UniProtKB/Swiss-Prot annotation, chains A, B:
Mutagenesis / variant outcome for changing residue 286 to R: Decreases the rate of aminoacylation with wild-type tRNA and increases aminoacylation with amber suppressor tRNA 8-fold. Decreases affinity for wild-type tRNA and increases affinity for amber suppressor tRNA
Catalytic activity: tRNA(Tyr) + L-tyrosine + ATP = L-tyrosyl-tRNA(Tyr) + AMP + diphosphate + H(+)
Entry function: Catalyzes the attachment of tyrosine to tRNA(Tyr) in a two-step reaction: tyrosine is first activated by ATP to form Tyr-AMP and then transferred to the acceptor end of tRNA(Tyr).
Main localization of the protein described in the UniProt heading: cytoplasm
Protein name: Tyrosine--tRNA ligase
Amino acid sequence: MDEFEMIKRNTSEIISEEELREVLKKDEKSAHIGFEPSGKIHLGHYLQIKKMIDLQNAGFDIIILLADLCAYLNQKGELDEIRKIGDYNKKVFEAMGLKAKYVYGSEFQLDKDYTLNVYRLALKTTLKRARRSMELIAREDENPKVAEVIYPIMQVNSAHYRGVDVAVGGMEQRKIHMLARELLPKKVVCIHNPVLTGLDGEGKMSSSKGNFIAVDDSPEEIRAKIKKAYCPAGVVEGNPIMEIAKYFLEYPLTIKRPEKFGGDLTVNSYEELESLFKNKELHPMDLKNAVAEELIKILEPIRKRLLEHH
Amino acid sequence: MDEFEMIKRNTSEIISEEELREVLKKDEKSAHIGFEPSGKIHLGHYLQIKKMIDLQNAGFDIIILLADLCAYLNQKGELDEIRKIGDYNKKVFEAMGLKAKYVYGSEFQLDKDYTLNVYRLALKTTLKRARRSMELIAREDENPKVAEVIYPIMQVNSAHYRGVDVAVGGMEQRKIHMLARELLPKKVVCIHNPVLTGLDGEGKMSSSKGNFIAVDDSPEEIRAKIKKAYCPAGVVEGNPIMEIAKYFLEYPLTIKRPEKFGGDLTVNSYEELESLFKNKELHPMDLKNAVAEELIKILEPIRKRLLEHH
Ligand code: NA
Ligand code: NA
């Protein structure tokens, strides 16, 4: 498997593929991603950190941006409280076995040089484009603040200031990244990860929506979450359980079933799993049971590293 | 005449009068006003500098903000070009006989402390309120930039940062100042000057509209400007010539007329002038002639100080 294909695997898009080609040649190449500090670290975070680990294994230096100032602008509270949580997030990522450097946005986002460029970019950025870029990101507010249109230009300027080759983020970030590619002199290669569906299937997974599995959820908690989860027979799209199977499980996957229901099933790939499920040849209870047990195993080392802190 | 009434004279409003009362008590009191550097300095500028001179005579320390960064945000060009013009504006104000300290916005508007508060204020400032505050200020643009909503919070933060007691500006600034009074812990007393009508009477006077008399216009230029100016018999409102008489001329004013047209008229106050003109008892040609000659005299020392530079 290519380093390219290893990097491309399970991404929603690379902007652009030929551009990524060029970067892979280099000895020195860097990639960063920003995270607003979150009270719980969930599968969504995990998916992205897994992609950063991919990049690290292809020889990228990795920078995690602990986005205290962006979180501040996106109404997550006071900065000092925001930074404390960022520190906790850092520990979780390390328990994920990521080898990276961690930087707080505010370490550089208030330098005079950075600020001056925020204002330069603000002259090039229409209010309509700025608001369009925040539709999937901004905290819901009946009375949108000026902060909301400041956010995207912070994210763009940061890509510029730190001189990174590759920016990684969820699909919700794509309009900001297209703005960055258009407004900056050096085009940053953008890799976008899919946004996981929440457990009830009604929206995207989100640490503010209570529709996630956190990486340190107890095994009984994990089982109950999955048991309740949206998962219609034959329905793959918008199905969070199938998403967990696609994004986190390793194959071949043995699905344990009673003999009376067809006995143990061994699936060699996710594509084969998808066809079984679509054919209504694998029942949601059996899929749920396996995903839950295998996910528990996957997240075990992470929970244990966090638990040993006491 | 009160110091209060001397300060109040020819202002559109004081926010608020009782607040200004309190400030006048102090030994140390400061007032500032910001100017976007302008290629020509006109009667509009002059009116405001005259009001600053009023404040200076009531014992205020005066600060002129050479607003290079605001001008930068309001699409007036590159900063280095903006600052050069600011320097020229400074010289014109000194030739007006103003005794003040002059500061460039950018001397302090990129400090880390200032910037951080711009972001704090941006969290309190709705996009709708911010755009409403810029309706009379923003350079026309079919595609409004994020810079436009950054401007009002710069102006608000500057009032905060420099700790000024009194902010002065034209009426067009009033929504920004109300925002400042609501968002800041210390309420700044705001004094608003009327906005002069352009010479053709079709809009407000403005150095980008070519409807002004500049303080250093030649006497023949001044006469031709006035001769062409909008000035209907009996019509006071929106009449720039009457505005010049109200705001710049001293009384008693002798209006010279041929004997065949009623001979020389001596008016003791602007209110008396207004009633003469409304009654169609003073013809626009005679009013124009006098305003032009007296304005020429008024602006003479200013033109001469600038001319001696060569
Ligand atoms: Na090498
Ligand atoms: Na004293």
